[PDB]
Design a binder for these strands. Structure first.
Ligand SMILES: [Zn+2]
Ligand SMILES: [Zn+2]
Lengths: 94, 99, 148, 108, 82, 85, 99, 83, 109, 93
DNA sequence: ATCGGATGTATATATCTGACACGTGCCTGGAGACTAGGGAGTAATCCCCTTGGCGGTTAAAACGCGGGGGACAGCGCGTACGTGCGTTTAAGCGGTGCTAGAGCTGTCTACGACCAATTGAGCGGCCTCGGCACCGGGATTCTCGAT
DNA sequence: ATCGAGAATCCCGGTGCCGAGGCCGCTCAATTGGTCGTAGACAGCTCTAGCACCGCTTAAACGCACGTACGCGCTGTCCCCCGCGTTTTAACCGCCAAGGGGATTACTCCCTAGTCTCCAGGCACGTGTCAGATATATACATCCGAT
């Protein structure tokens, strides 16, 4: 058989079945969504890495990710994303 | 007696038709041949995946459409409706492509 | 403040129109700590089971969920030995519009129909899925000696 | 939160916390990766994905369709003030362009 | 060997792109200028795509090389991988 | 018509509406309650659980969150309890 | 009888003078005050290294000089010599700053 | 110790000098307000990132390196001030 | 070579090979770093530096000065066609602009 | 105190190689330091990305050569590749 | 086409001052030697997918013609900007004093890497039915010559 | 201001096909449990430079007036895009056929990391002197009104 290749298809589909329970998605649209998720992951991770390097640290904590989100996302996408991430981290820890 | 539309009313219909669709506007074989010619200029005896040529076509068409939008704005700036080579040159120069 | 008015209104509703088989009240001097009592559902192997639990209110209410914890323990896939409860209303899909009556009714309804998708104690859920009679007899054995 | 349940469900997410943790740790970003970075990153990614998908589904519904296609993604992205700014140098394949005819060109 | 294939980008094929760009009227000298700028763009992208191909020690230009070159030039493309 | 006092009670704080906001689902509630449920709750409608993230983003960056047609009625017909609020 | 230059020659003289030098054309104190005002709009109780203000002034003056070059090109394109606000708006649009 | 309406400190002669360095011979009368708006927008965009960089470090002074990092992040590299 | 001199002298460079090796190793670029990568990178950096310095010194001599100031670096960078393309989006502090005036603005003959 | 590393002395050596008479002021040397750091970061990042693309875990000299070919324009790229190849060949023996 | 003032710019000389080029102490980072293990280079095999060729049919390209609308040049008006002068404002420079916060050192405790056994989440392959594409006929709606 | 003929676009109903969504088998990547070295969190002290104030020049900003030259509206000519009909060209689709090279697997060896020891290259600090800026006085190029 072919070698295994990972993707974000099932998670994007699970997210889609929450906002719109009665809507499907094409294969090309799923490819575009996977590319978008990969691109944003790379952007945020790289900004966090540089941010941690500037302060002579060795760890990428949630603070570096928060500041990277603040730097990268536009006006209020940043506010809402920071709120969601803080909510998720607080819910995970306790 | 034969019915003719005034010059300009069939251009707007085409504008409305082609901004509502998503297909590619260049024929596939001539573009593929041009891509192969440029590539064989770079390195001899090359092979292409079909997806490679399709991606190149997508990118080229998007670039040309954007350049034509900027060219149209440049033409309208000088109180014209006809786009001319100087409009393309000015748009490219301001965008920083040729300086 | 606002949370005080909210909890007083909740207590007034609870006193005027109490639900069926659930009784809640302020256990301590402060209104933040509460005690609740639940009777086992009629169509269940939990007959005659009375359960006491504690309610701890977070400082910001109702924008954050309350903490309900069993004083005793029950043999259910969604309840561990410490008394924690695994219900989506409690933590995941909590909304400020919900009231104490709704969450207590949901907790009571959990006993009739267990949730096997994400149980707190996987082994007892697997035992129940293997055979219903064993799960019923074990639950009855625990509840005939510890519930009362 | 209580243990003995999946990390993606402890935080109430759908995107994988473990996969993102591995990708952060193996991606040549920093020497060490904290325990709370993957949860935050997965939350941000899921928020962005849901935000785009809601508008895409609305655009699909406005056409009496029931399936999202790249044209609907382009329509959703380019009509939003912040999503257009975030994805400004990005080209969506087979997405077309927004209808926009300058008012000077219209007949008078 | 192939030669003089830039004339396969015909006049109607450029008029369609102009129409999608929202252009009502076009002069007669536009087509040669468009062909020249398109040739420059294609050379710029294909050079880096072939460079990526040669580094990997392959003899075929995969779509991922084109995606990587486009991202390298600030022209990120969605739909073909990456 | 004129809404009644009981019908104009916020379902979150159980008090009178101050600076009401109406979601695209025609559910009205207090502005402080809306901000608190956006920041600390799941960022939806507290009643029907309709996702209102994009609507919030669109309307709060131009100071258009607050309902104005009904705010005048609330502030005009019932002055005393708004004053003590 | 008093001597005065025809309108335009002193402008060219200033063009030649200010393109030969490298100093900063904005007075330092007003720019420092404006930077401090914007910063306190962002975060209160902030202090500024002098190097920070100097770097900000360098960047802003370079940006404005480039924008004025583009504006001059846009103005000349329309068969004019005065730069007008529409030239600035078109230059900003084509560069993608305002879109 | 607040500051108010300081953008008027970017006087008309300064804008004329900047235009002269840019190669402009004749200037309209409404250029100055447009230039003031553009300058304010650019300053806000740069200073926001500078302040974000300085708060991530738990500092209270905006160093030159924060400004340089913000400028590089925006696509406008600046030489001669470090890094 | 003899494997007895300094690494920069063994490779024939003036830029440090050991420092570049450390910067590549500690910079979070890859898990492993080869043995000949720092030499290649140092050679490229030194070549670019020498080119820019030569052009700047030529400009300074033409200006009757014996000290390169940022204006001379700006002149050297902007006059060249390859360097100006490599450093197109870069700003030089205290560098100024090249003198040019559009032919339309010049006086009529 | 603290020790800060910089490319000042090597830049001065190269300058005295090309122009034995001209000096260099402080601001020009700072600009040269910034330029060297910027080019180092560009080439190193491109090489790391090339290594990641091909599922490698090392940066050899051919990754650096390909990064140089990608970044620098034509004649600059050719000359830099020649210089690097010469340096590596002279160093290995 | 000249020619005179008149003004601004470029050239040669003295001088003096602070930044550049060099020298010295020292200490921290780079060089030398050695050992262990996995990463990558090489040889071989399989089978996917790339290239090449034929025949047909028909959608798109190429060519020509008539003409109307738009590009471009010439004129006239008047208003807004350039140039110059006198006056008012606040930038720039120096000098002094104070303290808030950046920077460095020492302890130590908790967080993150590493390793081994284990199992269920997610991936690959199969299958089927419904959504969307297409065709054909009719209703709806801009367009333009003629009043 | 309008009526109407010719033409393009939108609506609606029926048929069909292929690809999106669900199911099954399985392998490997994530989970859990335990241990250990060190990163960074915190307290304390130093001392650098960022901030605030005061007084004096005098340079840059401001306000006003005159006039001219450039922006803008208008008219006229002509020619070059546009819309439509016809003919020629080759794109596109379905098909078959061969083989190149991409992708996976197994084996081996040698190249790089990690550790310890040692020493000298480069950094910080201190000092002299000369390259460049400034003041002052001519020489010359250039501009503008008048012939
Ligand atoms: Zn309320
Ligand atoms: Zn609702």
């Amino acid at each position: 058989k072919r070698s295994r290749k990972e993707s974000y298809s099932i998670y994007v589909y699970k997210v889609l079945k929450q906002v719109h329970p009665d809507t499907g998605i094409s294969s090309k649209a799923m490819g575009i969504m996977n590319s978008f998720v990969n691109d944003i992951f790379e952007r945020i991770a790289g900004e966090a890495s540089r941010l941690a390097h500037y302060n002579k640290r060795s760890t990428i904590t949630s603070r570096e990710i928060q500041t990277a989100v603040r730097l990268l996302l536009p006006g209020e996408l940043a506010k809402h994303a920071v709120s969601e991430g803080t909510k998720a981290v607080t819910k995970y820890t306790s | 007696k034969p019915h003719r539309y005034r010059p300009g009313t069939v251009a707007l219909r085409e504008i409305r038709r082609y901004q509502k669709s998503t297909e590619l506007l260049i024929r596939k074989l001539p573009f593929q041949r041009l891509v192969r010619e440029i590539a064989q200029d770079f390195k001899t005896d090359l092979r292409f995946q079909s997806s490679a040529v399709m991606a190149l076509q997508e990118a080229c068409e998007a670039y040309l459409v954007g350049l034509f939008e900027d060219t149209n704005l440049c033409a309208i700036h000088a109180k014209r409706v006809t786009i001319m080579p100087k409009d393309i040159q000015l748009a490219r120069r301001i965008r920083g492509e040729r300086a | 403040h606002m949370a005080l008015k909210r909890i007083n209104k909740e207590l007034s509703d609870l006193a005027r129109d109490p639900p069926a088989q659930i009784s809640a009240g302020p256990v301590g001097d402060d209104m933040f700590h509460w005690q609740a009592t639940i009777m086992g559902p009629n169509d269940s192997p939990y007959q005659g089971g009375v359960f006491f639990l504690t309610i701890h209110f977070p400082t910001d209410y109702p924008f954050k969920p309350p903490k309900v914890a069993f004083t005793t323990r029950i043999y259910h896939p969604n309840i561990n030995s410490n008394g924690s409860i695994c219900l989506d209303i409690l933590r995941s899909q909590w909304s400020p519009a919900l009231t104490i009556s709704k969450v207590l009714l949901s907790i009571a309804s959990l006993l009739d129909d267990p949730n096997p998708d994400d149980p707190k104690v996987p082994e007892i859920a697997r035992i129940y899925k293997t055979d219903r009679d064993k799960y019923n007899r074990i639950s009855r054995e625990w509840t005939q000696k510890y519930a009362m | 939160s209580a243990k003995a349940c999946t990390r993606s469900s402890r935080a109430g997410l759908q995107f994988p916390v473990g996969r993102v943790h591995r990708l952060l740790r193996k991606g040549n970003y920093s020497e060490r990766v904290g325990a709370g970075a993957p949860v935050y990153l997965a939350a941000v990614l899921e928020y962005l994905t849901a935000e785009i998908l809601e508008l895409a589904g609305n655009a699909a519904r406005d056409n009496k369709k029931t399936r999202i296609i790249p044209r609907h993604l382009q329509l959703a992205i380019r009509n939003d003030e912040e999503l257009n700014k975030l994805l400004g140098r990005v080209t969506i394949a087979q997405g077309g362009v927004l209808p926009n005819i300058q008012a000077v060109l219209l007949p008078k | 060997v192939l030669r003089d294939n830039i004339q396969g980008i015909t006049k109607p094929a450029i008029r369609r792109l102009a129409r999608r760009g929202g252009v009502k009227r076009i002069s007669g000298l536009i087509y040669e200028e468009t062909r020249g700028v398109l040739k420059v763009f294609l050379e710029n992208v294909i050079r880096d795509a072939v460079t990526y191909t040669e580094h990997a020690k392959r003899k075929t230009v995969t779509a991922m090389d084109v995606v990587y070159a486009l991202k390298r030039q600030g022209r990120t493309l969605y739909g073909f991988g990456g | 018509a004129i809404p009644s006092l009981s019908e104009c009670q916020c379902g979150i704080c159980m008090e009178i509406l101050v600076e009401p906001v109406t979601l695209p689902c025609n559910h009205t509630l207090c502005k402080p309650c809306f901000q608190s449920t956006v920041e600390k709750a799941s960022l939806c409608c507290p009643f029907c659980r309709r996702r209102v993230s994009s609507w919030t983003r669109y309307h709060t960056r131009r100071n258009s969150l607050v309902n104005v047609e009904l705010w005048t009625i609330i502030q005009k017909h019932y002055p005393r309890e708004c004053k003590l609020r």
